[PDB]
Design a protein around this ligand. Structure first.
Ligand SMILES: *CC[C@H](OP(*)(=O)O)[C@H](O)COP(=O)(O)O
Ligand SMILES: [Mn+2]
Ligand SMILES: [Mn+2]
Ligand SMILES: [Mn+2]
Ligand SMILES: [Mn+2]
Ligand SMILES: [Mn+2]
Ligand SMILES: [Mn+2]
Ligand SMILES: [Mn+2]
Ligand SMILES: [Mn+2]
Ligand SMILES: [Mn+2]
Ligand SMILES: [Mn+2]
Ligand SMILES: [Mn+2]
Length: 325
DNA sequence: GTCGG
DNA sequence: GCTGATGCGCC
DNA sequence: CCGACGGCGCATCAGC
């Protein structure tokens, strides 16, 4: 792991800023720094060298220098000693508990998994499912299991209506040998950007997946997005997070670009669009006017067309992952 | 925390 | 009810 | 207090 110490240091600062400081822009600055340094194909020797990379300024340069000399960072040492900061950071790793709820719980004397399990009545439904499956959701999914999960979802969606098309996106579509969860992009002809012909399009698929006891629990559910829990039939497999996103059929290419990721790739791509005078979301690419307001959607017949508009060399899903050297 | 302006 | 903001999450 | 930083779904509350 080339520059592993520096990238792990910056990831740890990132998590502190998001979870304790609630500084989401400092979080994203530390992650940018970590991603660019992790992609750099040379061992960094000084802070002055790293400063040449985009997202590495004076401050990050000065703690690369410190880390390289001492193999540690006083700031991070002091943060780890802070049992309050440690407990907040930990509680946010539970789904439904974010920086705000985590701080409220720690200030009311909930510092550990045991304390959390005793105070189950303080938790809403989401937080309760997040706690119940905390251990399971920490495990990654082997690709062999993702293929099992893909077979079940495709088959049940087909049985509801053959006109449905389900695409497993996220790290799976980027060709990862393990994934954190299963992300399913769903389309149907009856749902487009300008018309809803059929109601309950996402609900019908979730109900079928619940009927065959694949989906076991619901975190959140609306008209276009489902967030819940699934499990493979035993031959017990761990419980897995599943996201299902229903996208307008005429906006599939913008939808699949978003849901394929990575999260850092999307952020960088959408940031470059703004430089070139475009705004990208999961539905459309729109030009920004003189005002800075979004005009009419531009025509998209492929993922590559979106790249072409912002003058980016097309990257295959495999090349949209984060990498190390 | 970086960086454009 | 709608709009806006906060807090949770997705890539 | 230079101020933007990717963009948005779902859940809930505040103000109208
Ligand atoms: C990394 C050091 C900090 O950079 P940022 O603009 O989050 C500060 O320069 C020092 O942190 P403080 O000593 O806690 O103010
Ligand atoms: Mn490796
Ligand atoms: Mn590289
Ligand atoms: Mn620089
Ligand atoms: Mn959490
Ligand atoms: Mn207490
Ligand atoms: Mn209680
Ligand atoms: Mn995923
Ligand atoms: Mn997911
Ligand atoms: Mn650029
Ligand atoms: Mn993710
Ligand atoms: Mn500022």
């Amino acid at each position: 792991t080339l520059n592993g110490g520096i990238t792990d240091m910056l990831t740890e600062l990132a998590n502190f800023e998001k979870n304790v400081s609630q500084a989401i822009h400092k979080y994203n600055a530390y992650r940018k720094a970590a991603s660019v340094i992790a992609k750099y194909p040379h061992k960094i020797k000084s802070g002055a060298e790293a400063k040449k990379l985009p997202g590495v300024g004076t401050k990050i340069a000065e703690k690369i220098d410190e880390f390289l000399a001492t193999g540690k960072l006083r700031k991070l040492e002091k943060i780890r000693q802070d049992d309050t900061s440690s407990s907040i950071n930990f509680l946010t790793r539970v789904s439904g508990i974010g920086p705000s709820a985590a701080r409220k719980f720690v200030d009311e004397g909930i510092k550990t998994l045991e304390d959390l399990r005793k105070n189950e009545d303080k938790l809403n439904h989401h937080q309760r499912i997040g706690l119940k499956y905390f251990g399971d959701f920490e495990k990654r999914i082997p690709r062999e299991e993702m293929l099992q999960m893909q077979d079940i979802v495709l088959n049940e969606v087909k049985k509801v209506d053959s006109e449905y098309i389900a695409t497993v996106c996220g790290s799976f579509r980027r060709g990862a040998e393990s994934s954190g969860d299963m992300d399913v992009l769903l389309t149907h002809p009856s749902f487009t950007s300008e018309s809803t012909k059929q109601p309950k399009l996402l609900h019908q698929v979730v109900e079928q997946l619940q009927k065959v006891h694949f989906i076991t629990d619901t975190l959140s559910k609306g008209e276009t997005k489902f967030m819940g829990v699934c499990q493979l039939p035993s031959k017990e497999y761990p419980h897995r997070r599943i996201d299902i996103r229903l996208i307008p059929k005429d906006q599939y290419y913008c939808g699949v670009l978003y849901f394929t990721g990575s999260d850092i790739f999307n952020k960088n791509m959408r940031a470059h669009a703004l430089e070139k005078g475009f705004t990208i979301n999961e539905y459309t690419i729109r030009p920004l006017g003189v005002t800075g307001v979004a005009g009419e959607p531009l025509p998209v017949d492929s993922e590559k067309d979106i790249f072409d508009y912002i003058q980016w060399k097309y990257r295959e899903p495999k090349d949209r992952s984060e990498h190390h050297h």
